[PDB]
Amino acid sequence: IDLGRVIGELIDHRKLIISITSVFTLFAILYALLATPIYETDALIQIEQSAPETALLQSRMILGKTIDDLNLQIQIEQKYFPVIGRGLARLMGEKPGNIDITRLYLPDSDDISNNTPSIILTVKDKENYSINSDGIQLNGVVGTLLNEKGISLLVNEIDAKPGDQFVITQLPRLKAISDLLKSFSVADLGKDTGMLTLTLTGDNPKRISHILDSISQNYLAQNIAVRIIDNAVTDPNPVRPKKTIIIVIGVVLGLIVSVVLVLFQVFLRRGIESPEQLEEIGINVYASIPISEWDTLLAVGNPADLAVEAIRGLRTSLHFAMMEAKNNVLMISGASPSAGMTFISSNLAATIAITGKKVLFIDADLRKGYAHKMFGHKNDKGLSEFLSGQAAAEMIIDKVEGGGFDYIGRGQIPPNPAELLMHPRFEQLLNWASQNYDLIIIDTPPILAVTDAAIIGRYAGTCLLVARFEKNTVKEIDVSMKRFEQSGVVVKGCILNGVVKKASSYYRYGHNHYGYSYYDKK
Amino acid sequence: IDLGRVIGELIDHRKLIISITSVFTLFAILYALLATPIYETDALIQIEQSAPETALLQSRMILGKTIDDLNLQIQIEQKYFPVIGRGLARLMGEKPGNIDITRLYLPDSDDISNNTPSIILTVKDKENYSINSDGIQLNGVVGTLLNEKGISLLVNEIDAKPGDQFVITQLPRLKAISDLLKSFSVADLGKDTGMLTLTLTGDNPKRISHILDSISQNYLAQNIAVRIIDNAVTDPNPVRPKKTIIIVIGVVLGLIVSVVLVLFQVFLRRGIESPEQLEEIGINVYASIPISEWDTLLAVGNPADLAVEAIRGLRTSLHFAMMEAKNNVLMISGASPSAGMTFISSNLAATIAITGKKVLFIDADLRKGYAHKMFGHKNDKGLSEFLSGQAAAEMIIDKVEGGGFDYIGRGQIPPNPAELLMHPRFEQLLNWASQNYDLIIIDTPPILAVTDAAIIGRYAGTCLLVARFEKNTVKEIDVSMKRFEQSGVVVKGCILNGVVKKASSYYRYGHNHYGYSYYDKK
Amino acid sequence: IDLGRVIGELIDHRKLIISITSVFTLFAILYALLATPIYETDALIQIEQSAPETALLQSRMILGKTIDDLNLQIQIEQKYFPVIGRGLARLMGEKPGNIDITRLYLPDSDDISNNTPSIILTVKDKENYSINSDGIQLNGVVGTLLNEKGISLLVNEIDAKPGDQFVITQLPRLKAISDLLKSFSVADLGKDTGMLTLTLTGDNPKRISHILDSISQNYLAQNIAVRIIDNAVTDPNPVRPKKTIIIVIGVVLGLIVSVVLVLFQVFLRRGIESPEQLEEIGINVYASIPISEWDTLLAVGNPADLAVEAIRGLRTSLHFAMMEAKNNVLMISGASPSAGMTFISSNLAATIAITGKKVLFIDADLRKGYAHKMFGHKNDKGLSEFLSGQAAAEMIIDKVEGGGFDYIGRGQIPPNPAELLMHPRFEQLLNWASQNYDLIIIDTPPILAVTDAAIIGRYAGTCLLVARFEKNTVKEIDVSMKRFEQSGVVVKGCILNGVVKKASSYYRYGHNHYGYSYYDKK
């Protein structure tokens, strides 16, 4: 592999790369926009050391005093049903509702796990509200305290709109301290000075400055039984999420994932990429048929199609290869099913019919042949009924309507297709048809599926394999040609079918083998 | 690759390199000239330690006192509509207008995001002015304070010209402190001495020295309840942008981008670079035709053209290659469209006509042939009308006016061009024309587009391919020659068309294959 | 490449190397002699620490006091129109004029950029002088102060010669301080001692010691409200420019530039260097003709020339190669123009004429042939007039005066030279001339220019190519020989022309192929 190879692979997989990268960037952007902004407040403390003062600031004695002063054990969260409802509500300009609770005593279930009892407060208006802990509905009003059902709650100054819910948790005093201690940090900022930089983070920019002021004043009033230089103010710019590093990592992570997936698909693919791969093995490729993006015969529906043009090139290559053949019978087979044997043989039969030749197309796929459906059919009396003796050769030949050639359909699907083709009647039909037609094209099942074509190929002067572009492997076509040779069938060459335009072929080989459009646009 | 290869590539891509480099240097120069110059003022403080004094200088207590003294929360910016209007106005010698505001109270919208209310002051004259916050126009005069619409503003000493606008922002006190703290730095300069070096940066050289003097005097007056050695003066030479490092990086970055683009285009190109590439494969190249920089026949319009000289060299190479041929019919085809098959075949036909030979040019491109337009046409009765039987051979032959040879045009575009050429009439026309002409040149469509030339090439004694210089690949011409051989058409050789002078060919190979001019200048 | 190869290349490019090196050394010497000598004065200060004393010495308070005492804001520079006039005036022994100004007040334009107003003082005599700021001429006298036009100036003791000009700048007080601070340094020299080493640099050796004395005394008088051990004295030997390191770098930089240029020219050259390169390809080289440093025939003007001796060696090699040829016609062509085809063919014709043979020289370069000018001409009735039928073969043959052979000139330049040569008259002329002459030498245009020689070479029994020594490439001659072979012309071999003596050929190959002089000196 070299620069051109990898660049051609990147150009070919550009939809995959762009889609995976854009999905990663979309997820990164949705996280950067929906993650809750976390602010930071800081204060400056003057110490007259400061290493023992750091551990006393972060102690449950000092921090516990702040929890008691500000009631930090009353956790109130706006109710949002999804994990993103909070972020998007912030984007819609909705100001988050906040309710001020000064007294809260829950019944304190204190069961095996839920040591944090919780209720749900649904705002009804500016004055009154509702409560439902476990379905028990209780109406409350701002002002008048509530002492019912073993639930004490005092809600002051509901600042929200009606209909909003709030989860009100009464978390234990240590849990309130541990939460504060996790977001609260102390530093020295000079490592020698009597300066302490207390920082505190949180989602509420006003609350965290009230907490850091409480921590400073409590540590101040406790120390005298020290100077507060800068009282706590909140930096209005959130510190998290850092949107730029998140989106940048989303782009970069999306690219390296796109690149390793493309790198895997390139090192794992085994199918044919160009006719050169088949010709390295000594297999003559007589045509490379592109995918026609356009029960119809393509050579009849769209004669100017790029695949019909490639099949005309096969018609002229075959006129030169089928000379010096024993008979005018051409068998078209392949390795795998749905490689294009019926597409190619029937469209080849149509392009040889317009040149004024008498062509017979035999649907010798007694298993899955559908050519009668593709040509318009009097389905009775096909090749099955003839081979089993219950039809004459004249009653099975039928004309393709928009075609120009006759065809024999497969008939009713026999139970013994490979043994019907071994009948001496099949060689009699070909010996008869080889006198009334200039060319007989026999469509057969694939050889790596069944053995029918090795039986039929005994009576064909020319046999061509159809290789599917990315679906077949070089070894698959080489195994197919040698299974024919082992049964006495000489394969003249191959027809590469289903080629698509690929920049990697243009860089790996000099040619993409696709073909040019050549028409006067009018 | 070696030194000569890379140097030839650099010489060939010199326009690309020079343009990309000059674009990068132009952008670097425009940034270095339009970026606002940022100055630096410094002061020297004597401390009787200095590590705790550094953190007290950068504290919101000291810095907040300077914001209050100098009203640094009143942000005034000259109004410039583009992101470069400020820089270019400085280059035009325009002195920036400044207005002195001593009292500012905005209505303090304080909405979800815009915590910084703003108004726009449009100077009317030296004395009075206008104000428009959200369209509300208010007229104000220097001196008399304004208390209207909840907007307090006192503008003193408007120093500007009429028509100038100014954005007047009332940013919060912490935002004014954070802005000052970002540009204000303290150092010790001895790490032991009682010397503090206070530096401050900003776009206004006079203002930043007034701020650094305020910071020093406030920190001085606060410390007594210390010596100021050097009061703040501004270095008149801006510290940013550093123009030399910016332009130098612009040149260097522009070169390495130009070099990687050239390095990519060289490793990615696959087209033919010299006839040697075709002859490594065993393809005879009979001529290398340069691009003629000069509906005309080049061999008639400019007989002395360098491409007509190269085509004469082909005329003499063909006189030697077309001997021992079955007939006097020469087919000219190629791999891709617009490779020069019509240019070469028609100009070859013109250079063989001046030598006194009877030449017939057949436009056998029944799809996109335009030779009738290039020769002057009685468009009726071309090769289509003849092949379909509705025209006699005598009615289709026409004379090129300034030519010297006859031609058969393509006729009306048939619906079945490849099947018309298979008619036995085509071989009858050639067998007839091969008796009335010394040479028949057949122009055909490209073989990797359609199969027409493989049909026509059966009746031509000589077949030449035209390869386009950089557009075709060696593999494309090798695939073309083998598609002819598979249909029984022997390609004598190739004609490299469209060669351009390239220094890389002169270093990679010994020869650029372009050709010399040889005329007496008069 | 090995030692001999690189040494031969260095010997061959010795003029380039010596010139580039000498240019670099000349520039280095001119800089070392014309750069202004910058002196250094130093003082020793005793401190009773010294780290805070260093920053107080370099402060705008101490340094500003020295600027005020010595009026260092009055910048006076001798006026020299070029950027080197000052340096060369020092070399001519001219003592620099100096004027003592004690009072200077300029009108202080203080515009957008020029904050440093300037005037130009032109000395008229020892007593009076002139002033011109912006064309305003003012006459002043030493002693009497000048207060006119808003310009205060007091010039004392003009020490210069009449006619000298001086630029007198009044730079701002900070600019005077910043200039002093840039050249003034303080060190400790023991890192513990109370010793300070004040150094100061400048172009004036007396002034910088007066400044460093002022800085010491000001810092002394300020410190008491410390000992000066060594008062400032100037080292009379300038510290800059360091001439030896500059000239040495000039030599070394000049050599490495000379070496990389030679290294590039060697790796980039593609032309022929020795006949061995042509014989590696299988091309017979029949002679190597040196450049004759001597409208004349060299073989006639200077028969003893080294190139005529090499052409005699070709005459004897051709007598052996032209046997077994179909006719006595020798065609001389080449790849490129001005390779020496006319020089060689005409001088070969002259050296074969002195051997008593009848030689015909045909100037078959109908495009740019000048042989008639080189032989003395009756220009009418050349080969053009004959080929076009308007002249008989007898009327076109003419005798070379100092030659000994006949010649046919090209005639009037035809519009169709390549088509005139295809006339059957050309072969009739050669068949006629081949009976009346022992040898016919045909001079032709170059084959990579036009196709004329491939037409002419059909009727020549022997064809030789002339290769130019450094101008042609091996591939160019190989492409030329194969373009002849493709047109049925067999090239017997090549003639290497224009060889020059090169030491690189003697080391790369064993031989330089130049030839020896062999004559008896009298």
Ligand SMILES: Nc1ncnc2c1ncn2[C@@H]1O[C@H](COP(=O)(O)OP(=O)(O)O)[C@@H](O)[C@H]1O
């Ligand atoms: N080059 C092609 N372009 C467009 N469609 C194609 C091409 N080759 C095959 N197909 C389509 O793919 C399908 C499977 O191909 P088919 O010929 O029926 O397979 P099989 O080899 O088993 O006979 C068909 O519907 C066929 O029309």
Ligand SMILES: Nc1ncnc2c1ncn2[C@@H]1O[C@H](COP(=O)(O)OP(=O)(O)O)[C@@H](O)[C@H]1O
């Ligand atoms: N060597 C050339 N110099 C200048 N123009 C050229 C040269 N070769 C082709 N062209 C021009 O490029 C265009 C396409 O070439 P053309 O001969 O018409 O293509 P095609 O191979 O399909 O017949 C034409 O207009 C032709 O005149």
Ligand SMILES: Nc1ncnc2c1ncn2[C@@H]1O[C@H](COP(=O)(O)OP(=O)(O)O)[C@@H](O)[C@H]1O
């Ligand atoms: N070996 C040589 N020594 C000196 N001069 C030479 C030599 N070869 C060529 N020249 C001169 O260089 C010039 C060009 O050579 P010329 O023979 O006229 O070129 P051309 O190959 O086109 O006929 C002539 O003036 C010729 O005299």
Ligand SMILES: [Mg+2]
């Ligand atoms: Mg099928």
Ligand SMILES: [Mg+2]
């Ligand atoms: Mg064409």
Ligand SMILES: [Mg+2]
């Ligand atoms: Mg010449």
